[PDB]
Symmetry: C5
């Protein structure tokens, strides 16, 4: 019944990103009619990612406010549901040898989240778990750069390259800051929240920008 | 607060509820990536996943409040969605043989018996093994009538798309649907293993409601896009 | 807790609540499969199931919380929805005759006499038998106008597809609708059996509101399809 | 608990609430049945009816809960919807007269005097007779400006929509001051039942039915203009 | 109970909440009344009012359970909304200059200094006058960059939407500092503050969003004769 606790920096970013995702989810669904059939399914999936995110952010934030405990299970369940979706996006803008890419990328992301989970969950020591984490991460990055092998599809893929490399780096940076020093619960949750924001929203926005440029270029011809 | 990952059925319920909700949204929104011929399939898919969603919230509620198996919601959900899947089957069958309406009635009859028997088992309104067998009768009657009884009238190869669909519906009613009796056996024919029951029931709905849905959407999008040259 | 299987009236309420939800969605979405001629009819069918949904939620609430028959919720729900079905005749007949509004008025007055007499009986405002009779009178006056009165005049000047719609709709009011007075009869004219009464009413609501919508859906999807072919 | 049929007013709220819900969906969904000329006006018809729905839920809570007139919810709802109604009036004048801009401003001025007055009367901030009389003055001021003053047609739909407007702001709108008379100016305790039953009728007529008329006109012009 | 009318700001919150509910609906629904060209602009417009709506609902529970100014919910709304308003300024700006992305960043920094200052004052994190001066400075730095800095015209709809931006950020936004002045710089006057912030949200989100709607439907209708 009161105002937000400004002293609760973690409750505030939980709030902001909740909203971020809801705005996002709406933006992506409604803007579908400013891209052609070529791009529309991409946009749907962007919306599902941000929308599924939104519901768990609701649920995570309440867990903070009622207990101040880190919502690890809610956080990885969210990632378990959205990462594959982000990876389907890759397959989707390639549909070459794209179904093998999909299967490899998926298995490696499931490894990255299983490793990471086991650590935060106390099912494995914290540093080895991180390493297997990175293994599956870097294994994904490897198959994009080294593995395989229109101008719109290019600028679309390139941006995906960057986000998996540069963007995604915030998450293992978050895991590190929380568990790999001196648990640093606040720092973790801020970096994860910050990571979810950049990666689920900016990713969807890049697709959108490309889709709209292209849908517009094609509409004169 | 946090999900209790020790609650494996707990988690499974959460995952599938999300999948049904996401899939529901995906079937409805994507109606516009397919032609008039396919849109109603998308609607029915979305409806099937929609009803599942609301019943999955309820089913999780009971599992978590009490740790009992939500048999009634489970079977109520099936009662509502199985007929609609059978309708999806009829839609496909109407494209490729002039015997589709008769079949719809038989499938429906099969499906009601399958479910009524199964329910008797779990509700303890009849012994588990006879009930299973009777239910299996219903299931197989459907498979029979579809491929060896009246369904013995010709398929049509005319449309490669409708072939794809026809093949999917087969895979699902033969292979797909087989996951549910697996669940029942595992829960009731060993020596009640509540977890295994629900874990497998939950995987089956995922496969049979979402994955079936997606295969139809794929075929639908592919045929709709090809058509757009001609 | 799990739905109580042993409360079968409760389960029927759940089932129809869901059916109503589902059909509501189905009619609204499916409007993009019909031409401008039929779209509003599907908007109206959607509203019927939509109002029914909301009202089925309170009706169920009531039964499960107290065990009483939601008689006012029921009649109020029918009062809001019956006139929208009747509008449906006006909608599909408005272009091809001027008597559409005359008919409509007649059908409505029939429908209100029918509903009012039923309520009176079930609410204890009149004996159950006399109410049932005046109720039936109302119902039968609707069927008269539909078969051999103003409704017969108005449908002659009409296309095949509007004819297939009209007749299908009329037949649902002859045979489909009979489940309702049957339910009343089951409840109030025997040696009150609330269980049989809410069971049959539930069944009646399920069948009639969905099927009426599906008929209009079916004709329209067919006429609309045919119309895009014979103009291309 | 089943609805209480003896609560006439509480049944009245239930029904109208339900009508507003229905109507909001109707007007929004139906926009694809009208041409660009008419869509926004259907949108405004959904907003009025949508905003009325939410307030009717609240209005009925208050009645069921306390048995008292929900005056503030009533006038707040009217505060939000009446300018929207006056917006729909302006759009119609936009196609007709050549000075819709000024009329709108004047019509908006009347409506606010009207509601202000009405509210003072009911909230007990002013005697109920002068309150009524000032209220009436505002209303009549709007009517004057439409028929005799600054409001003094080359299309059949604009002709129907303009006339629809000219009729409703008199015969339709007249139900409200009637209901206020009924409630405060007959046996001066207050007659809450009559007051609320009559407003509930008036919101019904003026939000839903008048909305159905614009829909009807629009669905006709659009389909006719669809050839050629 | 009936809504409490003695509580003026109480019903001010009620009214504006509702305006945002309605305007959100207006702007999405009316997208089919404008061309691709304007569609995104309206989306950003409903987003602004949608977020606001959800925040006002919360703001109003706070005023009512406690009678306290909901400073946190308010500035949290602005943090979400203002950047979104600045992206609408960028789309308008891209159409009438080569320099629009450099402007988006300067205006966004401008706007965050504007908001953090104000918050610091209201939150009690910093004396109320020097935060006001710093906050003004972020605003005026935006106005500087637009008028007489790196902002120095195409079709008549682009010029309309341009001019609306140039007016709102001067006269429209001005209503916000006026409220803070009214509340913290006179002798905390919490009613006038909240009444004026409510009016400012109404003008700059609903009214300004409405101006853009207007430009877009006309231009969308004109261009349609070809
Ligand atoms: C929508 C969420 C996304 C795209 C999440 C991506 C998360 C990662 C790439 C996490 C990576 C991690 C490591 C590479 C090492 C340790 C465990 C992590 C999970 C946090
Ligand atoms: C959406 C739900 C669907 C398509 C469910 C299908 C369920 C079955 C095919 C269940 C079959 C069963 C048997 C064949 C044996 C006895 C009872 C069963 C229900 C588990
Ligand atoms: C959507 C609901 C509908 C169309 C309900 C229709 C109900 C009737 C036609 C009821 C008829 C009755 C009689 C003819 C006898 C008196 C009692 C009845 C009301 C249930
Ligand atoms: C959607 C509601 C509308 C368009 C309501 C209109 C209400 C009025 C025009 C009420 C008028 C009254 C007077 C003219 C006399 C004083 C009392 C009244 C306010 C109720
Ligand atoms: C949707 C909300 C908007 C556009 C809010 C804008 C708010 C401002 C421009 C506030 C400005 C202020 C100053 C310029 C001085 C410092 C204190 C203020 C923050 C309230």
């Amino acid at each position: 019944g009161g105002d937000l606790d400004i002293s609760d920096t973690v409750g505030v970013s939980f709030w902001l990103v909740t909203a971020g995702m809801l705005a996002a989810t709406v933006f992506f669904f409604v803007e579908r009619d400013q891209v052609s059939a070529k791009w529309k399914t991409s946009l749907t999936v962007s919306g599902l990612i941000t929308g599924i995110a939104f519901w768990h952010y609701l649920y995570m934030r309440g867990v903070w406010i009622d207990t101040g405990d880190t919502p690890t299970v809610f956080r990885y369940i969210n990632w378990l549901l959205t990462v594959p979706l982000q990876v389907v996006e890759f397959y989707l803008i390639l549909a070459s040898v794209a179904a093998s890419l999909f299967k490899k990328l998926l298995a490696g992301s499931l490894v990255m989240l299983g490793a990471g989970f086991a650590g935060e969950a106390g099912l494995a020591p914290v540093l080895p778990a991180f390493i297997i984490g990175m293994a599956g991460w870097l294994y994904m990055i490897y198959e994009l750069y080294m593995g395989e092998g229109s101008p719109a599809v290019n600028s679309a893929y390139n941006a995906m390259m960057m986000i998996i490399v540069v963007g995604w780096a915030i998450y293992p940076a978050g895991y590190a800051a929380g568990y790999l020093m001196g648990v640093y619960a606040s720092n973790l949750n801020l970096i994860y929240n910050l990571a979810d924001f950049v990666n689920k929203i900016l990713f969807g926005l890049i697709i959108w920008n490309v889709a709209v440029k292209e849908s517009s270029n094609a509409l004169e011809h």
